[PDB]
Design a protein around this ligand. Structure first.
Ligand SMILES: *[C@@H]1O[C@H](CO)[C@@H](O)[C@H](O)[C@H]1NC(C)=O
Lengths: 138, 233, 142
């Protein structure tokens, strides 16, 4: 229980970081939805020409040093669990650290932001859906 | 989609998603064949990636249900992305790498046969995961657009003063009174019409402005030949 | 040499007195298999010997199992005879997923175990039917 007020939190905060990434893609993706359009000739194009350009990688990349770090401290904190309903979980908090340090790698080869804001778009939706079961037992 | 009600499940099975260059939609025919606007792959304005999503109607699960790969891409030869104000043949066929099994949420759409489906006074439907009236979307959206008298659609164009092209390979749907109309992000869907056979009479080609006006839908009936022959599996 | 005998009624004897150098042929009915232990044969030839004893074992003649139906893309099947039988004159029918799929074309989806040993349709031969995707008609369009 004492290790949970330190693991439950950090996992719930990691989920907080996740939805903070997909919602950014929702707006950013839309700001490019308007850029590549047949209705907006050059009324919003000039607006998206700088608006959608607001989104950098240093922002998103830093948005990862957070998720992984937060998911790397829950795994290191909840290493005390020795029974079945927690040691089965421990690794679920570890493969995610093995699914995070794989995602960060995909960013590092992508050269366009919207190309890198997708190689994860199928990932961090299910990854967040994986941190949905660590609540029941908790 | 602007002025569009939420889409319940089963209503629009064929509807696709294209995060290729930018967000957009499509349609399903047979099982391994996606229909979408040519400009979804080739906008008029860095290398892209072809990502097709299918099955669900809420965006989240659609992204949790994997992006099917791409086997064959064929855009119609009558397409020129160089021409900044031309959209003749904004039609394209996409072959899926691996076929999808058909269920009541993954059915394919039919094609039109008579020109009749292109009369003046019939209600068709257009679906897209795109921009709503004052925000973005997370769900599928359906609208009930009547096909318009095209003579007035060149009247509307010259009334806006526009040196664009309205090739008869196109029909136009809507009315400037219509609060409901196609918007950006739905630029690949299909004007779905019902006989109970649902067919894809039109492709979301282009237009000017999102709400309150006439939209330009590349009519497919002239192209149905190119579709059957490009489905040679 | 001592004359042979027919184990079951599933063995017609070809070619009353058998001496030396003599023999007899063995073929079986119209659509059955012949086997002498566990080795699939088609033409049995028993010769005698010196001491007046047949060397080889007079084989049994069991019915030709037409195997399992070649797996059908998007579609199962129902046994129009007894469930789980693949012997002679069995008759089955593939069906496509209805109504999400439909069959390519008058019942000509009806296959049956012929005497050869493979599933043959009355028209399409061994070649099974084909299920294509049904366009339009959503389970709930409007
Ligand atoms: C197509 O048009 C022909 C000629 O008017 C008509 O006979 C036929 O019923 C129509 N078929 C459809 C699609 O209703």
């Amino acid at each position: 229980q004492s290790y949970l007020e330190g693991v439950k939190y950090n996992v719930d905060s990691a989920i907080q970081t996740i939805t903070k990434i997909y919602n950014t893609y929702t707006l950013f993706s839309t700001k490019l939805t308007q850029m590549y359009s047949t209705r907006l000739d050059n009324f919003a194009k000039a607006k998206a020409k700088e608006e959608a350009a607001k989104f950098t990688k240093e922002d998103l990349e830093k948005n990862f040093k957070t998720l992984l770090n937060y998911i790397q401290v829950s795994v290191k904190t909840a290493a005390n669990f020795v029974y079945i309903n927690d040691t089965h979980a421990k690794r679920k908090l570890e493969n995610i650290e093995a699914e995070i340090k794989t995602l960060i790698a995909k960013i590092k080869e992508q050269s366009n932001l919207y190309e890198a804001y997708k190689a994860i778009v199928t990932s961090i939706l299910l990854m967040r859906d994986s941190l949905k079961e660590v609540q029941g037992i908790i | 989609i602007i002025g569009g009600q939420k889409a319940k499940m089963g209503n629009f099975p064929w509807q696709v998603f294209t995060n290729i260059h930018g967000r957009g939609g499509g349609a399903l025919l047979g099982d391994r064949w996606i229909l979408t606007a040519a400009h979804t792959l080739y906008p008029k304005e860095s290398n892209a990636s072809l990502d097709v999503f299918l099955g669900h109607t809420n965006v989240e699960e659609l992204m949790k249900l994997g992006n099917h790969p791409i086997r064959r891409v064929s855009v119609h030869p009558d397409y020129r992305q160089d021409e900044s104000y031309n959209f003749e043949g904004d039609i394209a066929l996409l072959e899926l790498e691996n076929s999808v099994t058909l269920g009541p949420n993954l059915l394919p759409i039919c094609l039109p046969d008579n020109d009749t489906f292109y009369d003046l006074g019939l209600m068709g439907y257009v679906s897209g995961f795109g921009v709503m009236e004052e925000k973005i979307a997370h769900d599928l959206r359906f609208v009930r657009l009547p096909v318009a008298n095209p003579q007035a659609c060149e009247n509307w164009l010259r009334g806006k003063n526009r040196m664009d092209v309205f090739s008869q390979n196109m029909f136009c749907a809507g009315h400037p009174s219509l609060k409901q109309d196609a918007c950006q992000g739905d630029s690949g869907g299909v004007f779905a019409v019902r006989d109970d056979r649902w067919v894809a009479t039109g492709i979301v080609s282009w237009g000017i402005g999102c709400s309150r006006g006439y939209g330009f839908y590349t009519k497919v009936l002239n192209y149905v030949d190119w579709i059957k022959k490009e489905m040679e599996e | 040499c001592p004359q042979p005998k027919t184990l079951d009624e599933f063995t017609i004897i070809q070619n009353p007195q058998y001496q030396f150098r003599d023999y007899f042929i063995a073929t079986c009915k119209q659509g059955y298999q012949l086997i002498e232990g566990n080795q699939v044969l088609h033409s049995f030839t028993a010769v005698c010997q010196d001491d007046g004893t047949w060397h080889r074992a007079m084989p049994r003649c069991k019915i030709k199992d037409c195997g399992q139906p070649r797996n059908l893309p998007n579609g199962d099947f129902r046994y129009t005879t007894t469930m789980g039988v693949n012997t002679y004159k069995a008759r089955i029918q593939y069906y496509c997923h209805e109504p999400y799929y439909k069959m390519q074309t008058s019942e000509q989806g009806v296959y049956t175990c012929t005497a050869q040993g493979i599933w043959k349709n009355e028209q399409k031969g061994e070649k099974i039917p084909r299920c294509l995707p049904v366009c339009g008609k959503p389970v709930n369009p409007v």
